[PDB]
Amino acid sequence: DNTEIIKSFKNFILEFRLDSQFIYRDQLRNNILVKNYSLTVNMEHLIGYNEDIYKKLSDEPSDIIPLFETAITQVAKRISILSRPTFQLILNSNANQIPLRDLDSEHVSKIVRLSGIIISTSVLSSRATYLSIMCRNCRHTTSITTVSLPRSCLSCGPDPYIIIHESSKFIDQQFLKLQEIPELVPVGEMPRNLTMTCDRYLTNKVIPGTRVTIVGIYSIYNSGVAIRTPYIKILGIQSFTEEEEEEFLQLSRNPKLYEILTNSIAPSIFGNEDIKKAIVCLLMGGSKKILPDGMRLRGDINVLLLGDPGTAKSQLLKFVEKVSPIAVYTSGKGSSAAGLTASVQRDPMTREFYLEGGAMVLADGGVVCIDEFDKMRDEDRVAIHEAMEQQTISIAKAGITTVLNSRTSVLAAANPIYGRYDDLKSPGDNIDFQTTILSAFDMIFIVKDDHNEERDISIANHVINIHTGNANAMQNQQEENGSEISIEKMKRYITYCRLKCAPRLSPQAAEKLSSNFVTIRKQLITIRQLEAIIRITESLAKLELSPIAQERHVDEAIRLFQASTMDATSLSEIRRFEQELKRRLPIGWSTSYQTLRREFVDTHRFSQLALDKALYALEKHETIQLRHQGQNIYRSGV
Amino acid sequence: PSIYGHDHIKKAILLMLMGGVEKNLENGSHLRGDINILMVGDPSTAKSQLLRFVLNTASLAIATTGGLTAAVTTDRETGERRLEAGAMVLADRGVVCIDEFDKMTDVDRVAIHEVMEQQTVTIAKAGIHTTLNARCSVIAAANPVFGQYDVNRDPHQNIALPDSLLSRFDLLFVVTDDINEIRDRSISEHVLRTH
Amino acid sequence: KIYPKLHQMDMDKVSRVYADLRRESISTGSFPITVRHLESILRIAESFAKMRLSEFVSSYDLDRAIKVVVDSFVDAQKVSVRRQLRRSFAIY
Amino acid sequence: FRKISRDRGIIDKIISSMAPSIYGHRDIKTAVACSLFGGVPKNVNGKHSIRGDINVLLLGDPGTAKSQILKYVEKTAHRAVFATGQGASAVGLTASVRKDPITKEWTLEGGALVLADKGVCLIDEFDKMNDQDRTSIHEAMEQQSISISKAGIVTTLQARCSIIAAANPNGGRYNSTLPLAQNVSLTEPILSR
């Protein structure tokens, strides 16, 4: 009876034809030439070739997969003999995957398909696959292919046989931990973990933090009254519609795409356009590059929100966590280095120590949102230094040491000390943490909320419109007009942009960056800042899916850099204005911005740009202080 | 070759690699011959590149950063224990490369005082007492707390390391990216060619 | 059961109060008045409406809300400025 | 209920109903009543959210019943949790980690803020608690949730509760001649919540 199943497998391998070629026979022959004793069988071809064996495999694979292994081994040996070990079955499939939470007591011994993220992987273990044994009582020998030794001799007392080690074969096996995507986990629930096992050629293909697609068998094993631990026999691991592609390409073709997306980030918040665009750049992220010496340039864009409390700084992160396809949100107080980063923990199911990824490891290839960043401990910050700057995490615990990569973008909202960021002080004095952290972030935004009449009225109007419920209809109409993008559609667009394009800079953009950074350096920030700015234009080019980065991106990147980092021959004219003001204003005197305008600019002694730049520099040089939004100017020193 | 200028630092590195000559006296005294070099200034400014070149070029260069004292035991699976070698001891007749020298602990400082002065290590522990040779040259880099070096003051206030520790370095150099636009362009054109 | 809804009938009566509070907090050590404090007026007006079990936010509820928020802000200033802000917000 | 609702000026009766044995302090009683009733947690279009509960701070000199008011909110609200400043821990308030006695797996157990979900959380002597336990309340005061990352557990719990806090000024007596931002050891961020 099973001979018919073997014959059907033999036909499906040797005689099946697709694309006018014997694709399965040719691929198995190529594997034999490579000496890879494994065959990747596609389930979508198997269902199309024969439905009855597919029904048998779907309902009772318990005897089918031994038949698969032996038939593939026999056919591959026949092919090797024609051209001049047990071959492993690998299954590729595209059918609908059952959710992990939906696995139940009904899918026992059934082949299922799953998707998730790897959080922990064990070390390799050697398992027997072919044994030869000898009786100690009478030296009778035999071969054996869960397996247990015979209780009596075939020729001697109970348990007479011993294993002939030099005439046996063994195979490798690895234990894996899978869990559902946290983005698909509703709040109030810890993501469900799942144990998976792989052997031979399927081992060491994944590391913690890897997102994979699974084909395997749901089964249980004994390790609670009758709580049998479930585990998965791994069979195959894999790791947009055409109309969706056209829709997102038209969205890219939109002449107002950048502003539409800028408004689309938290439309229920007013203003904050600069930080909105910066967060857009963070969402796109930079482009990876590799040095010829093997080092990798960190392409992640890390932004520190460092403004006064109550400025919608937390709401922005909470909105990004919705938008980004891969997002992790956690508070600084409720986290730890062992939790944020990877850790080594013992698996009670297999009684072995496992390397387990952390929160930032889970955010690999995505964005992590952290709040109250100023309130975490310094050791956690030291680990985050490595995570940000080297994209790696170093672990030295118990008696084992390892290094694990983490390509995680970090968006940190930090509260400046003394509550309110005093403008009289350098940013270092308004901060309580390691100074080198300022050298880690690419940009910082010290947002201010100075009281104003008309701007507050407009903000109040927006908030009353939101609470009235009119905002819902307004957003719906804007989406219908194409001026606002749906959050799900925005996430789909972001994923498509991330997966497809990877731009590179142009010589025109580089030369302006070099000139502007030279001017900034001469005025004064390190060389690292110029290379960090490249991430912004790469991110913008990724947003536009342009083949190369462009200077028209560099303009907005420079504007954001100026409005972020500088929050706290024309130079000769500026310094001449400084000298003329030092002569005009004795120490301790007071004046107003409009008075200076009328007396120096309306008289054309100096230009208005020179006025603004000189006032800015003198305020940084502790010479003068600006008060009451420019209505009062006081010379604080020489 | 990756650093433009800094001829004196390169000369000092070459002389340190060459080293002096040790002597012995009829009274049993011994004279130090090796040379040490210390680097100070802004962190990213050329200290990492020079240290990388020194570590890759020297045949017996050992990298260190904040078990170097070689006075700690590692235990076997059966329970018995054995000492593990330290970098300062392994680098005998070699060179020691230190990065983030400011971040090293006080125990490391009090241990390295004797290493730099008498070229030896005096181990005194519970049930273990021995003396080991530490005839190694030392090159280290340190950075100020503020990140920006105050060129008007000595490292005794910019980094605030003990004067006794600093005096054990034969040569000291301070580098900081004082920007000259044409010279920075000339040196960074090579970097731009890699982008 | 009760979830009162809002209407924009009294947008000015809240916006001008918010502007007044922000103006009076521009140069004195006082509460960190921000948008979050603006939302307090709306939420406490909703709470006042939810006492009547009314389905809509009325003008009277907003009046009492503005009274409570403005009185809370004023009663925390220093003595010399308190007697001036007593008269500066006599409208409310 | 509908018979009661039609009375003219019902708001004043409700306000006078809070803690009747406490004389005066009407400006505090109104805030207590408003926090008890709360507002509307408008999850505008889903993609945006606003906290629906009112947060109240009772700051004043000793002998002003800043504490016994909380002993009325605890006895009036449907679900109330009471804690003292120095008798609380950051782990204890937010969430604690446990190992399951059956499966030996890392598990999480909710703290006081998780217990007070859809309720009210009370913190007495809010000024005298250590800075870290005070910091643990930051996310709960606006996000109405607890975010944690411990022993590999990464999750967020619902903490939809209002916070009523009582505190004493610096030195134990309020200096009327000095601003509020100087009479307390707290900071503008915390006050903004």
Ligand SMILES: Nc1ncnc2c1ncn2[C@@H]1O[C@H](COP(=O)(O)OP(=O)(O)O)[C@@H](O)[C@H]1O
């Ligand atoms: N421009 C704005 N538009 C709309 N709402 C705003 C704006 N700025 C602040 N808010 C309000 O402020 C709240 C967010 O404050 P948040 O940033 O969490 O405070 P903190 O800075 O102390 O964390 C939100 O409820 C939001 O409604």
Ligand SMILES: Nc1ncnc2c1ncn2[C@@H]1O[C@H](COP(=O)(O)OP(=O)(O)O)[C@@H](O)[C@H]1O
């Ligand atoms: N306004 C008031 N009316 C009536 N009794 C009061 C009032 N204020 C305080 N008390 C009495 O004084 C005591 C104050 O207790 P407590 O709340 O601990 O004071 P506080 O918290 O203000 O230091 C209460 O037992 C209460 O009986």
Ligand SMILES: [Zn+2]
């Ligand atoms: Zn036998």
